[PDB]
Design a protein around this nucleic acid. Structure first.
Lengths: 206, 116, 64, 146
RNA sequence: AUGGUAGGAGAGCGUUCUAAGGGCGUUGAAGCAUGAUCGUAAGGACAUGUGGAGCGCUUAGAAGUGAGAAUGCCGGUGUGA
RNA sequence: GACGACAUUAGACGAAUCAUCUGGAAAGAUGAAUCAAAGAAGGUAAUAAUCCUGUAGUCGAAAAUGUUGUCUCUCUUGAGUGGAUCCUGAGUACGACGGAGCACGUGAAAUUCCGUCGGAAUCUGGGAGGACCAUCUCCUAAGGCUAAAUACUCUCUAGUGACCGAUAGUGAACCAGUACCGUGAGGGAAAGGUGAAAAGCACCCCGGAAGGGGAGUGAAAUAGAACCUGAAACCGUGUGCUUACAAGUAGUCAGAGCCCGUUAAUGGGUGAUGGCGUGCCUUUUGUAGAAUGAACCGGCGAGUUACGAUUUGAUGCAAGGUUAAGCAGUAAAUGUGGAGCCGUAGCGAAAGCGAGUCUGAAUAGGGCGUUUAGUAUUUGGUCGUAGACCCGAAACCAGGUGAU
């Protein structure tokens, strides 16, 4: 429940105490799957439609008479077995989102965090000091802390300079303590947090 | 996402066509008539795996009858006396002994005779 | 849409505690002079909807 | 977890039955419907409760009653629900709501006598049953009809 | 000890994407169409052609998902002198 | 009004990288790099977050002026008591008779129409409010009016996305409401697809078409106008290996001649003989037709939700239930959200009573209950409403076109 706060040169600046109610639970794989599935379905727009037999152009009249003379009996040239169309049960524009109870959602966020802290995937630094955006600077920082390819960095509220700095190293994503979702915590290979951020997420999840 | 039916229909039909090879006329070319024939030929072969055992037993018994009648015996008295003697060898084996080794067949014809 | 309650059945039936439907008795309400007095008072006790009928009429009173 | 090793809980998902896709599914040609008649047809079948012309069950039974449009219903609290309080505490309707024993005080609060009280307190509500007031005053304590 | 057009709870595949991971690929990589493998499957990893720049595998989710007939419709083709 | 920013809108300029080796080239393997508000995607004989470009920055012009904090004129500091007398709205409130709209089937009717009636009141005012008189709210109805926030998008316009990916959002991303059909209203197709570069066979040789040669920009013309390539099947057609006394659901189970082996090991076969022999199919007590319907390929051809109900995983999480809308957020997650919405108690037609209650004038029996488990729940088979598995009537109605 103690974690080393490093400096940006990566040496050491102290230790810190983080709750086991947040960062140290046994992670719940069912709630985690359920929340990942939920977020993936809230992202899709269901913007797909086809034309059914009453909305295909034309085709009002019966094409030959009912007792024909040697032909199958047909009713319009836009019936589904005709090549002009009329689709039977196609896609309809709809929404795919759904909800799930509030503190199942907090249980998922805890399982994601406590899985990060159990694979030694959690790095807490003290503050980022970026006074102008430089990706090259941030790249050297992520090299001094031995970070993998995919990394989520969590500030406290809004550093526009570390946002603009880290913004297109591929594999790096930058979030606020309030903007933590299960999908990018699970997607990252390691988590870097500032000092002020980890107290905030310990105080809204505990 | 539309899925269009591509390539899977043709694989499934083409292997039935390849099963029908050597068949007369439009049974080796056209899917529906070749399919009905391949169904029927699976059914036939299922039946004939069982009829084959009856056919070969029948042929062995006919050969044994011919072999036994050259020693003035029926098949039926021979098989009875062979049973009473205790001899337990097949009809496949008995028919092959009568073809190959005539002397040995005469030998066990004598054991079938005096056990009666 | 919400499914609609069959309003004619909801005037005639009442839901018990477990799940049943207590019901009113037919053959009441008219000519009793052809009846004995025993059958007059034994048509007064209420009864339940039978289970073969519940199979058929379950969805009609779902909101009751 | 990892996003490449996702796994649902066991027994929590199932594939749906797809009808009319060939013979070996067991739901192949007639698709579960049987052969002819009204229930084989599309959009077919008879509306619920209909029995073919024999008089339906909800026409052969009489209508009884009326519904009183302004009837009173009270939030019920029983005696074994009052033992979460401390002795001498004076329970009131707003305290019963705030403590979460009563969610929704409908037309008032009636105290009923089901459990055993086993405390001593003073209560204030709209209605009491007979047994409730007996068990409240019997332990020491007072009831007051707000 | 272990059949059922109607029955329940089953393990799976073609299209798509996430949501990923990991690959085959402009000394070539396809896919697709001709090849000995896998097979009850549905469905994929090494000789001709193709080109000549596009696909697989794994796990999970979503279905314009889901291909012998309907005197079916036709881009349609072609037969039967 | 100088009214103090329309947008700072036309817009346009305006990042920063890269070279080497093996097939045309690298954008495969080596070695490097990018400068801050861009560093973000995406289109170019080879896949440049650093060629076209945006994104960031720049200045920004017509009708523009955010449109304001003095904004000329100019405001309206309200002069408090009573209601005592006057005014407070006319064929009218006001109702009968036929009808309509109100959830409500016209009625016992609180709003509208036709026809007829008529006919009030004033400070002791009168008058009005889902049958009448006293209390409550209203008006000073009919006499009258007029506000914004409040609806909605052909395609307008520009800018964007598990989407249409072209039997397609479209009938039509090609010559499309065109060929064509019909007197007319009207009906209504097929056909889409270099570029590596026409470099499109100069040149040259035998018959008009078409060939055979060379030739070529040809990294490759069986890549020749069918450069979207380009496949299959039906059908072909010319070669061949084996195969010719008969009665046929054409196969299957029992074997002389000829072969020879991949993505490799009773491999791979090929083609001759005696026995035995009835469909996707459908519909049937029963069919294989003398019952139905049928060559090959395919768009390409038969299970959503508004949204409910009920029965079969995980939990806030179990004395327990919040969120629906809304708001803030990237069309997400999420956060917040009590003017707000199931269970913990049942019984009675109901008043009501309550671990009981109804019945009974009984507190009696007997019915229905009690003697713990649910949902903020959310999410995997069957029903309901939709028009609901698909295709198919004869016909009804409405609006039109037709006496060539």
């Amino acid at each position: 429940a103690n974690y080393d706060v490093l400096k940006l040169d990566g040496t050491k600046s102290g230790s810190i105490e983080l709750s086991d109610a947040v960062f140290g639970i046994e992670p719940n794989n069912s709630v985690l799957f359920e929340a990942i599935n939920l977020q993936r379905a809230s992202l899709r727009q269901g913007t797909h439609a086809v034309k059914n037999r009453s909305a295909v152009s034309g085709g009002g009249r019966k094409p030959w008479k009912q007792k024909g003379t040697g032909r199958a009996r047909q009713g319009t040239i836009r019936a589904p077995q005709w090549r002009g169309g009329g689709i039977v049960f196609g896609p309809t524009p709809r929404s795919y989102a759904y909800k799930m109870p509030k503190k199942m959602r907090r249980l998922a966020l805890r399982s994601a965090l406590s899985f990060k802290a159990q694979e030694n995937g959690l790095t807490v630094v003290d503050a980022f000091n970026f006074e102008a955006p430089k990706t090259k600077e941030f790249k050297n920082v992520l090299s001094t802390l031995e970070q993998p390819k995919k990394v989520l960095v969590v500030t406290e509220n809004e550093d526009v300079n570390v946002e603009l700095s880290a913004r297109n190293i591929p594999g790096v994503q930058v979030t606020t303590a309030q903007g933590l979702n299960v999908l990018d915590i699970t997607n990252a290979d390691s988590l870097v947090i500032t000092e002020a951020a980890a107290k905030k997420v310990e105080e809204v999840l505990g | 996402p539309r899925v269009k039916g591509g390539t899977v229909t043709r694989a499934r039909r083409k292997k039935t066509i390849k099963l029908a090879k050597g068949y007369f006329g439009s049974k080796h070319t056209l899917y529906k008539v070749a399919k009905q024939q391949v169904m029927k030929s699976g059914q036939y072969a299922f039946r004939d795996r069982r009829q084959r055992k009856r056919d070969f037993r029948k042929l062995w018994i006919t050969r044994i009858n011919a072999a036994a009648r050259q020693h003035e015996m029926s098949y039926s008295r021979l098989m009875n006396g062979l049973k009473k003697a205790g001899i337990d060898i097949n009809r496949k084996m008995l028919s092959e002994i009568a073809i190959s080794d005539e002397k040995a067949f005469a030998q066990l014809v004598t054991k079938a005779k005096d056990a009666l | 849409p919400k499914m609609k309650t069959h309003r004619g059945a909801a005037k005639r039936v009442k839901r018990t505690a477990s799940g049943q439907l207590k019901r009113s008795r037919a053959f009441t309400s008219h000519l009793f002079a052809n009846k004995s007095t025993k059958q007059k008072r034994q048509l007064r006790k209420a009864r339940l909807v039978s289970k073969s009928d519940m199979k058929r009429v379950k969805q009609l009173l779902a909101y009751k | 977890m990892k996003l490449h090793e996702l796994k649902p809980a066991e027994g929590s998902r199932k594939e749906r039955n797809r009808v009319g896709r060939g013979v070996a599914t067991g739901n192949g040609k007639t698709s579960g419907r049987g052969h002819k008649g009204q229930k084989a047809r599309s959009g077919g079948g008879v509306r619920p409760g209909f029995e073919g012309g024999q008089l339906p069950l909800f026409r052969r039974l009489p209508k009884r009653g009326f519904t009183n449009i302004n009837r009173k219903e009270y939030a019920i609290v029983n005696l074994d629900q009052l033992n979460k309080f401390e002795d001498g505490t004076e329970v009131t309707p707003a305290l019963l709501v705030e403590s979460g024993v009563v969610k929704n005080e409908k037309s008032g609060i009636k105290i009923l006598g089901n459990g055993s009280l086993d405390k001593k307190l003073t209560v204030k509500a709209h209605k009491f049953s007979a047994s409730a007031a007996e068990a409240i005053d019997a332990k020491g304590g007072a009831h007051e009809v707000i």
